[PDB]
Amino acid sequence: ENMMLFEVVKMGKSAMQSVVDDWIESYKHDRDIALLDLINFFIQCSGCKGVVTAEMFRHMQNSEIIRKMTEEFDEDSGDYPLTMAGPQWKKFKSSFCEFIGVLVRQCQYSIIYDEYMMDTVISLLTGLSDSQVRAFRHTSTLAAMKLMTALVNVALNLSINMDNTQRQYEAERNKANERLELLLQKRKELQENQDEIENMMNAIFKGVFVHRYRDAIAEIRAICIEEIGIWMKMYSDAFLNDSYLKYVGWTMHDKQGEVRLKCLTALQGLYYNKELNSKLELFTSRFKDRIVSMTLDKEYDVAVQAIKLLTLVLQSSEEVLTAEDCENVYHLVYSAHRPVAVAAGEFLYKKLFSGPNANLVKTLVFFFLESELHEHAAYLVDSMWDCATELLKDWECMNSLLLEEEALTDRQESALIEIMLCTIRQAAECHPPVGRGTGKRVLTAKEKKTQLDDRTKITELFAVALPQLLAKYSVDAEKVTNLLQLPQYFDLEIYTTGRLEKHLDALLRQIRNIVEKHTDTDVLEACSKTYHALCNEEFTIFNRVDISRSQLIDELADKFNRLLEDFLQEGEEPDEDDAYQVLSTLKRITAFHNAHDLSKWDLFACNYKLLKTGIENGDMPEQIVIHALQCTHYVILWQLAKITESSSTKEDLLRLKKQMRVFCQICQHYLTNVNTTVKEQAFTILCDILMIFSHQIMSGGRDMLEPLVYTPDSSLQSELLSFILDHVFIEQDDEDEASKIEALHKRRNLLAAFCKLIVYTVVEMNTAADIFKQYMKYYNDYGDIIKETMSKTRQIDKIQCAKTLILSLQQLFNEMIQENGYNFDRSSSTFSGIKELARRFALTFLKTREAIAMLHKDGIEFAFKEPNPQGESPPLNLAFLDILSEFSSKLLRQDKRTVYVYLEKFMTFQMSLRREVWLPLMSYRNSL
Amino acid sequence: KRKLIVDSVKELDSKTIRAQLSDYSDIVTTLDLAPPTKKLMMWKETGGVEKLFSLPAQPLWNNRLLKLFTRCLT
């Protein structure tokens, strides 16, 4: 049956040559019947459910057959087989294509020349390829294109048997005259058949390809380009020309990514071919700028292929690319998208990276410094982890290159530590840096051994070298902070088990040297984080390192006391140089009091004493204040950690609660300070404190700690919000990109600090009103924070959320009048946005039913709460409900009259009579 | 009416293709850079609302202090 053949290919279960061979025998017995089922197979592969008949075939031309098949198409949707999803339709797409191809290849030695089957098929294909019906035009174009590839395979076979027979003719001439004669007739017969196969190929090409490669439908565009890429590859002698390649050239500029991608894979195929083509030179000279421009394709996948292709070009020829082009490709190792970054990494390796690795390491350093786009090397190292892993892991080569003696500039030494430190991090932590890596992909067995071998080797090499390097560069703050991060990647069992105790001591000394000789904030956090990573109770160096750590803080703590003993005498008016001395030890203490339990030294007093002296006299350098606040904060957390048990105590808590209590009041008055950074610091710690000491400190079976009852006051609740409105929501414009985004992230951090207090009931939820109102104004900056906070408030009290929402709108209403007035134009694009905001707010709405009710029931009270003082008693708040009308849609049908009864308790009978200005009332009630 | 997709236009004309060839500025873009400072790399790791709502505003470098904040979120 007609349908039997189509349903076979879709569901062949078959060696498809079996269907083709069975089809071919049906053609030898009767040609007309077999062609009818081939025609009907194409029609049906298009999704058409109609049928072409014998009488239609005999007397009807194809344009008429196609018009009748469109009539009877009898589709149920706009989908056809080639546009369906699912593996059964992708399988069908493959059966379809292979059937066309095996069919032609099996008819290639006889039937294909019978001047009957292939002219029928081709005529049908190109008539359907000309149809406005997309199912037919897309499917025929795919069929013609696969059809055509087969013919290219046939001509390539003919060309090979034409030359084999030429070699058999010259051989028998070179050594009987009735066989040279049978050979020259065989050569002429083969030439005739070549001519017939070129005719068919030319029919498809001029009849289908040159029209359909520029099809309105991009997928049809992509089918043609992929297939011309295939012929040019398979029969390069006949098809690798300017007159076929021009189509690929032009289409590279297509506006659709799928199309541009197929152009590049097609060209990629003509290059791993890689064999001395010169007609490719002319094409690349003309289209090289476009190919380079596609390294920044809007679509990423095309950019990768563009880069990959360009790397082939380098191999094929290299001279072609020119310097500016190469540098544009190099810049992309810094790209956000790793598939681009490592493609450019490969181009960079190939072009300019080709002990031994000593100079290759220097060139990486020179490259990283010459390309001033990134200050660090994390992303440079990750763009090349995959290709040049052999080199980026030669730490011994980098190691003694910073030590054992033109030499190295000082920027280059700093570039090399960061580069080296980056290789170490990516080698120990086998993941890319943030924004490059996958979603917690876990590790192959070989990855895991490679991950444990590297790690020991790092440990063993730099246990010995780390203390030397630190000594040589102890004074540069940039290079110490880097160096100090290596031990957080070491395996510490190796320190003990491999005769290394001497070196650990030698470094721990060099670490206590740097803390003493530095005041940089990063230098000191590195010192504290490493001492933490070395004081792990799982390993046997804890006692050795702990002793050194206890000696370090015995020194700094006793000194700090001595400095405060002098700095705060009543008549010892301290100068700015005495202020740097205090700041230096305080900062060193601060950095260590974060990551280390320093309650044994009881430092609350000193910090307290100074915070209370800056408040009383108001003369106190910001940095002493900021750092004291930090230190105090660390002192209370650490105590609360040791209230883990009460194996500890029952009486110490009264002191701990009092210190949190006073520290809260101290932060609260540093929050109104004039200096921005002091405010942000007091605010930051306050948000953390209030969350830590919330009611939440004991639902998790933590009930012992209830007496730690600090709820924020009404005073602070708003001064906290005052901080947000003055320093988070700021005037908007519309040191270049890098610093502004830093500032945005810190403003986001501060806003989240407060919304955490909202979502967690620390401060009354009414305060979110002045935050929700900024949802559209600050969408890109703070949008995501605002809509997850307001949905968290929704999730905990849906109607309270609605009650705060419309007060947010109520607070954009009285902003609008505050400067302008009560006669303000009520269709302004200011008003219109408040209306749009509300529309979007409405969409947030299952228990939605009373939420929306009181929703309306507060907007109603706000809309007749103040009457017009000199007017018909219109009201002052009449129009505000045009906004609320955007909430009517989400209302219930039953309370869409309970809207009224409540509406009517407020609305006088006289109001509805009046219209002009009163319109907001009319279409508020009309909404209901 | 019929759901069968009939295309009124089948081909892009010559002039539009000439236009595509002479202007691709709308299908190329500027380089989206990865975080180019160490601190901008940190703010991408701890940024996004999920991490920001589960981490304190003042960073605590020892898990014991950190835990004291994490424990109090539900």
């Binding site: 390649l245 021009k246 050239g249 032009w250 002319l282 003309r286 | 010559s14």
Partner: peptide, 9 residues
């Protein structure tokens, strides 16, 4: 380069 000059239609 002139064969690659688009003059179709």
């Amino acid at each position: 380069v002139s064969v690659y000059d688009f003059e179709e239609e």
